[model samples]
Target: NDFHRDTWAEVDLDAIYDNVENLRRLLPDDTHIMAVVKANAYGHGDVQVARTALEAGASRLAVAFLDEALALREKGIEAPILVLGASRPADAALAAQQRIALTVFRSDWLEEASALYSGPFPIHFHLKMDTGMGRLGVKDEEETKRIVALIERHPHFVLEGLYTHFATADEVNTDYFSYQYTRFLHMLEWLPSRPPLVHCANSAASLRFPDRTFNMVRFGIAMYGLAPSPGIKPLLPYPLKEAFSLHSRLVHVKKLQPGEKVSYGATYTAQTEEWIGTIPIGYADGWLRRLQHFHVLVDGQKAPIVGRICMDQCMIRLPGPLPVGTKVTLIGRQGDEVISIDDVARHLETINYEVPCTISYRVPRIFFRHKRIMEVRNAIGA
Candidate 1:
């Protein structure tokens, strides 16, 4: 609980690897895995998390943007990384120069990218098809035909794979899922020949439609031991260890009399004289105000957050006397009870994706492997 001991988010690489292995076992032996490691590995620290996934038998990596892929390359990540999101056409040559894969869907851009590279450029890319998501890629038959025809003639582009994202694979209503699947397969059938690799399953689709497991599957949230949504269940039974554990320490512990309010805005009024434990974590550290009234782990007991979460601190109501330097578990195992990212998601009225990503970069990340700290980023100092 000492203020001197700075708070950090602990990333257990072993747990991450274990989660990846669990997913790997569910898939076919020959099916390659394109592990999504974008957004700093969903704020768990990209390099270490990516290494853990790769060590767990992931065949490739996927990033949301080009710079992220370049960052991985700079860190000596040698695995083939596909840019799952959009990259500007002007940067196509730069991406090719770095040997980073480029995603293309438009006919004009596809031809331009192929022409950008004069020599043999290993632009191992995935042809994204716009189904019902309406986000990226070619939507109509004419555009699809033109892009496919151009791809067939491009030598610089390997056309390594093709993929489509389901609009509602995690939902109960399979209307959008069916429509997207139909559109995707229709496009595939129109291709001159099947690309060497093809994938459409995100975590949700893979669990729901095992029959649709093309050459590879993009494992995103599932790689972090989280389901795509509450409705989606794991098809294969296995224990997935969540790799991230958030913790803080009680910087201040004091007895508050009845009527004493804690934190800014004085949102909570104490009903009775209580011992309050002030934890050194708040909105700035990704502990959003939505977590108010939620339970946190203190001395292995559930303690309710007493007031509004402030900029860098929050007060927790303790049942009894807790030492000033006691460990405050935000999201982790304490006794038989566990406060997981799922719990945080439920509190925030969102999903697991936003919960971990909200954990800002200001807070240090401690990457642990084999019970030892392998890397520490922004530890008390930028």
Candidate 2:
């Protein structure tokens, strides 16, 4: 390994395979799993997760943009890939010929993109009916019918499916979710003919409503074995195994005397004799600033992140005088103790999805299978 940084992230491909397999067993035999590898598989290395999930029974792959879909195709992943987000009209010719599916919400996108196509093949489209998220979709039956008609009229377009995103599927309240679900069903009725796939369930929805997961489900956050949300955990058909973990090592260590300050602004002043260790990680590595004063595992004991988290380094108060090169667990198990992504999510006052995605691209991700190192995705170097 040519890596220099002590900080690294690990991705368990076995966990990904098992999680997809678990969802497949829970979902109906006819239902399919569409692994959502958007945001670089939520920043866990897309191509690897895509391949592992496909091997575990995912019928298709869904991403948030055309570039992501094209990247997968360029990497030799030939599965039916769908871009869940909108694409520019000018890019349609490329996507259409490449056979990558694009999510359609407007007649203008269709009209403009269709006019630009000189295709030998049709571009696949999955109409996003805005049931409730109000982000990107058609509002009502009139708009839905207009887009469906456009899909029919365009020679370059093929109607692939109809879908909607849920705003409250992970929340305890089902009123909004129920309303969105009912509205999507109405939008489906407006379709002249159902395409091969009809999916609407993200990770939370798929686990919360397996029977309603229209022919397929877009497995997102939970596929990496993270719980979709705290509310949905209790209702999950089975527990999800976390596939990602963060690690680093102490690069410097020193004993601090009382009255000595650490980091910027001297926010953390030692009140008693303490051991401080400097880790080769900072906010720049996706460690985040809010985690200052938060806990990390050192020598199987909880050590608080002292002072401010710098852009390239941060200090942690160790349980003891930990030596240089001692491993630190930021998001994994050490001994009998564990620090999960959910724990970090709670600390950040955000969803678990953001925890990994925000870890930044600087840190290399080492993929694992059967407890063995598989490969590393390090953007810092080739």
Candidate 3:
């Protein structure tokens, strides 16, 4: 009835602040916190989360692309942002203009960037050292030497940092994690001169091996109160407080007699006199078709979603005769019951990272702090 939609994901800024604060308290005083706000802060909303993380204790920000970084800059975020993913050499000029840092691995990319950018403001670079991740980074000695030489030659290029990614930090096995760190150490000496910042720990590594926390820790999923991996979940030094919750309301409810079907496929038949409900959420809303059998909480009771999930709506077999407009907790707490994103992830047979990222942009995000609405992003008709 109001301007707000019945279906929306609620984001708690207090949880984000507390997560960062907890990390700040646990990590070494000298080490900085790099909040990884990529994928729209893992779909909890970026600009707001970025500000909260910084206010809490994060020293910098990291995203997967230059576009992601520029979005924050446009929103008046003044903190230093590092693009964790690669960008075109031609865009180095824009990166410098925005005062954003870019990751570089290849010596050739450095040569190309130096040629493209005759900077009024110099571009900052973090040389990505590939110990074993098998993605963007300098793994070969010859390439590392050449990349360093190119950076030295480019007057406009600043070697702001050196970093690597861990291959097994989230896993139970430490053999590969140990080897990656060992390899990282060898490469550090490979450079003739050390940069001001050197970091290699992602959320999992930083939590499990705080001793490896060099100058900074790139906190991502954990910052959103999710474990880096299922294995790392139990071993966490501190408990993570989830910041995202999804909710919707029962728009329609009906009594279906035996043989009556529901949804696109009419795949589910009412075995007896049963209560059915339709919620305003479906595959298009990032509530995938595979979740047909998955349950949503209605009046704090488990209601099994029946039949095939359509493009815009899905049907749930309600516990009993429920009234229209009853609150349905899709992925959040309702009274004594709770449905976590992890629960959804488990049903999908995937990781928690995929669950939130898939929560399509069509769904509006309502952000809250101190028990009041702070902002709403991508609201209807906006």
Candidate 4:
């Protein structure tokens, strides 16, 4: 059943497939692609995106936490799913039973797991070295060696990979990035034999420096048709087609008298007889309050968002008295004009990743392929 609503996010699965295939084409035949589906595939609906990615040649799927990995497992995604963040030692048996990979950063974690889990199945894991991104990994070479030796000796631990994260791979300056690479290489020398997979480069490094691929690359932002950062946009081999777009319809439209106030705190007033439109999406739906001065497209013209954004609604200054159900394009093309996710990120002084992720789950996700609806994840009950 279609739960008709004024606001929804249209996710183009075909575009996602294309993006993955494009990246696959760019990578060498031997290098594997691990699709990053963490944060609900950056809020594009993880299960669907993961399915599309796998169909497009992604060898494995990666998530940020154990629960995310479990979610995919529940959905019948039997691919090798890696939990990229910390995992509880207590969950080792569960993860091993499901064939999920855990990322290990410290010897203490291994010792705890060794004590807690007398696993019937071995827990496959990747050792994370803190080459530069000092977030979660052993920085000391001696400590890394200790942890690797522990994994090798542990009855229930299987070392599947060794990896690190780059701190400046997406930046224009390569000095720090090169330094991190050097550190990763130096650490690799300590390993008696490398694991089957040795990954370090993220989307930026995968695109800009192929030599850093190291047998596998974690395709994250680029797989979603977003540049890892603004600096990497110009360096891309081809333009990435964004897979996400936000849309709504005018629920109310009326003429505002001059000097009449609008919305909370009367933050906006009509300068002259003006047309006003209301959209049934607001801060509660992730149309944030700070977007008051931003613009929405109506009738192929830019309509300035007026007044303070409310919890469930916001007003826009329409060009004229548009129909109550007129289409409103928030983050997509309108005529020749476009409001890309990058535009929103720039206005908010943030990155493209945050823009789409911020679109709360309250908004429905409508999946499409070749202009036809494939699925609808309606938050609102039908």
Candidate 5:
């Protein structure tokens, strides 16, 4: 609370632990949990969330890029971390030295890597199959077999796992998901010997279709206590507890006369004399300009945002002239009212996963557990 900036995000580590524990209970006894902590744990602070999830029951960690895995390593996290995306050939040796597993989709990339490393150590990797998402991975069984054979021949590499990404596992219709699962199963048959791990289920598949949990589950969005999609809510075994909340203070409060305009472009005009409060958050803080009409929680009441959102501030039409220091909740609970990330995403015509991640790193993150502040990442100079 003593941080220099008024706007900050509060991350509840307890909530994160609860989410992971719940997932562990729902998953099968032998299925390993890989907590996806990329994009700073979906902007919930990667190292903190990663540590919390592992302590709660997660067996491993997964990230989108090599740098993220490196960051966790720098923080002294020695957990088994898998890079779900391709890595640079030059960095493969370094990753191998650090014992990080990378995702491989191309045999040439591995060939290039082996030439670059010529290492004393072997690089661990997972074969990513392009089942149906059509993103990165070996496209067909032929290519998959070719890469598998290459890894088998190359003494510098170890095939640790095989996996695929699903494009529509969160959707209510299971046809596309089923097709992708079938394709993944077909791809597995090409392997001379199955890898130690075979994971295909993302958060959506882990919750909705337990059958797809093939030895391991990559838990991402749901680990942050958000549903994979609106349609999958009913299928969740237990309710998710949201771990992140955006908070700011009413820095300035004033009464505007009738016909007075607010913010850029004069988009919002006061119909009558109105009380307006300026929040210390705006597009720069991931509260985009499109959120002008969205409502924020002020003293448990709704305050409609007015005018074009600025780079560092936004004006809300408050019910009255609230105190300048009154707390304002952009996305969280206040009294009996709540503004979930889902509400913000629906307004932006996006998904809940994007909402928290879009919140810029400029705002500090306050990590809390048991209603007490454990640590604060103050990006602003203390």
Candidate 6:
């Protein structure tokens, strides 16, 4: 077995509670908050973050896949949970049996689902209409018509909601965004005056288009204290504090002379003699290789990541001496400076969505409440 003690992410429960409360205050009293707890609650321990959201006034939760939904249920999260992605027709009965809401777009899939069920299954379903995402949902007018007709006939299915995803609500490309909204409106026109729970707003739409708050909003990345995207940051009406903070400790420190090769492949060689420190985090722990030339905070001082980032360790070129067990701040504040997810996203040529979610399961998440350690969720089999 390999032994390493250097890095882990710190989760701020207080920040999460504040973020949820702020979002709650923005919405009208009747508008329900469906806290999106998918992707391991944006990589901040799913159950813990979900609980925080609930306490902060979230009415329900949403996940992208089945296993994720199952994880919440196993954790005793009895609030109404919905899976936004499509589930197999063969598994429809099972999903109903478990009382998990299923999303349907295909007509034949519903036919198969009807055949599989012996009797009425408690299948709460949402009919997804393809607006412009080009991913899932009923695309053409004929398909949408057929789907509505099916909903009218299928007594086993409870048509709890109607929804569609936005392709670029956060981007400047308003062409497709407007087109999708128009299509959704047209689709809803055929329904009764008040359709049950018609939702179209993600984090971007909820903040940008307050008028489009039809029934509910599926709060996703924004709830985890991140902007929907870089383009949407300036448009937000309120401020948000990131809930996840990554930290580690300096395990190895040494003085290196000029021309010294460091780490695997020797991708980087020191041009000047300097003091270096090794941090216990790397690609395997969700600390991506993109941090190769990035900076981390060591005792409130900025230090550059030198050499190729290893699988479970990284080398930082510190300007001065740093003692062993000194705390390292990877994606948070130290003194007045800040290393944020947005910063990392820009450095990695990606987005904030991937930064925290990329943190691997091998890294333990340290939860904090009121700036005190509440619990530590170890990596699997700990």
- Model 3 lDDT per residue over 236-338, tens place: 9888999999988999999989999887867889999999999999899899988877999999788899999988888899988888999998999988999
CA lDDT, every model vs. true structure: 0.82, 0.89, 0.90, 0.90, 0.90, 0.84
User: Please, what are the lDDT tens digits per residue for candidate 4 over residues 1-382?
Assistant: 3666689999999999998998888889899999999999998999999999999999999999999999999989999999999999888999999999999998888888888888689889999989888899888878988888988887889899989999889998899998999989998888889999999989999989876688999999988898889887888887797999999999999998889999999989899999999999899888888888899999898889999999888999988778899999999988988999999988778889998889987888999876799998875656
Runs of candidate 1 exceeding 4 Å displacement: 1-5, 111-116, 172-175, 234-236, 379-382
Cα error, candidate 3, residue 104 (Å): 0.3
Per-residue lDDT of model 6, residues 137-170, tens digit only: 8877777667667766777777888899998988
Worst 10 residues of 6 by lDDT: 1-10
Q: Assess candidate 6 and give its TM-score to the true structure.
A: 0.94
Report the C-alpha lDDT of model 5 over 12-81, residue by residue, as the tens digit: 9999999999888888889999999999999999899999999999989999998999999999999999
The clash tally of candidate 2 reads 0
Tell how far residue 223 is off in model 4, in angstroms: 0.8
lDDT of 1 by residue, 234-321 (tens): 4435666788888888888888888887778888888777898898888988899888979899888899998788889888989788
Per-structure clash totals for the candidates: 1, 0, 0, 0, 0, 0
Which of 5 and 6 is ahead in lDDT?
5
Off by over 4 Å in 3: 1-4
Clashing pairs in 3: none
Error of 6 at 282 (Å): 1.0
The C-alpha RMSD in Å for every predicted model, in order, reads 2.5, 1.3, 1.4, 1.1, 1.3, 2.2
Model 2, CA-based lDDT: 0.89
